[PDB]
């Protein structure tokens, strides 16, 4: 049955849905129409994390290249507010690809497209101290823009990047996975488009709303701060829904775990980059794989426990 898939077409599907089940190199590219030179990036993060008691910690995996996830805690039982700001944690070697200044992101690569985006949480606390739950749902976050006028001289109209759909984070989506903290969790995201379009690399983005822009001028519900341009930043936004995770640690609960992140991304390398040396033609069309991908994705649950992974 699974012999109707091309070698890459199968490889592709593994990086997509179960990259922890394989030792390395889960994918060789996207078996879609495109066959130009690309680079298969298998992003993986191993972050040990301790959750503050009485706090409902919120984690996003959403498709910012180089940056695994974004988090911030909020008083138990509450959600992010205008007063909340999320800070990135990055996949090993962020700077080694996007430089150290908000205007040197497009130095190594010019564009990209995510294939997979998985994440798992493994509990490391004992069975006497733990308490709490892990709730999960996915949001259709897209990156758009807001237009508004400014009273400068002469008076002008501005336009900047704004995130639409963040409002979905302020409430537990009806379609969600929720279970005891100790049981951990595994979930992944997929392409929220009828095809794998390429997105450009974005220069100069370090905060959203931007510097000199007032929140909710944006109509964003909270803020995104990557920090120092020399350590992190926002280089792009893929056509993947964002995974929302709420770990509610009750008072006096000792909840700790190991978090893992997977991300198969095809980048378009620049000839002046050494990175280019590892380029290969994207895998040619594999209609079967592309059809299975769609079906499998729609079939799977929002998430599952740790062991089921």
């Amino acid at each position: 049955a699974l012999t109707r898939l091309s070698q890459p077409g199968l490889a592709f599907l593994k990086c997509a849905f179960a990259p922890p089940d394989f030792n390395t190199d889960p994918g060789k590219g996207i078996p879609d129409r495109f066959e130009g030179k690309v680079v298969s990036r298998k992003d993986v993060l191993n972050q040990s994390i301790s959750f503050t008691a009485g706090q409902d910690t919120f984690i996003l995996i959403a498709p910012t290249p180089g940056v695994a996830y974004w988090s911030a805690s909020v008083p138990a039982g509450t959600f992010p507010t205008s007063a909340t700001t999320f800070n990135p944690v990055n996949y090993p070697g962020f700077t080694s690809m996007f430089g150290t200044t908000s205007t040197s992101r497009s130095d190594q690569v010019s564009s990209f497209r995510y294939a997979s985006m998985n994440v798992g949480i493994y509990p490391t606390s004992n069975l006497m101290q733990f308490a709490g739950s892990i709730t999960v749902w996915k949001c259709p976050v897209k990156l758009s823009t807001v237009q508004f006028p400014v009273a400068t001289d002469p008076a002008t109209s501005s336009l900047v990047h704004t995130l639409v759909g963040l409002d979905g984070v302020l409430a537990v989506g009806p379609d969600n996975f929720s279970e005891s903290f100790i049981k951990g969790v595994f979930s992944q995201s997929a392409c929220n488009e009828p095809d794998f379009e390429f997105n450009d690399i974005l220069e100069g983005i370090q905060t959203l709303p931007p510097a000199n822009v007032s929140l909710g001028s944006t109509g964003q519900p909270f803020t995104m701060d990557s920090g120092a341009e020399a350590t992190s930043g926002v280089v792009g936004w893929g056509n993947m829904d964002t995974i929302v995770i709420r770990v509610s640690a009750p008072e006096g609960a000792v909840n700790s775990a190991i978090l893992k992140a997977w991300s198969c991304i095809e980048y378009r390398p620049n000839p002046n980059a050494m990175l280019y040396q590892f380029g290969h033609d994207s895998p040619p069309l594999d209609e079967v794989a592309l059809q299975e991908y769609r079906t499998v994705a729609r079939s799977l649950p929002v998430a599952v426990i740790a062991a089921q992974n």
Binding site: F17, D21, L300, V304
Partner: peptide, 19 residues
């Protein structure tokens, strides 16, 4: 039920279901 096995089941069950 591992993740790869839950996946290989839906694929083969999809290749035989479409037939």
């Amino acid at each position: 039920a591992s993740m790869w096995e839950r996946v290989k089941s839906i694929i083969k069950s999809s290749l035989a279901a479409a037939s």
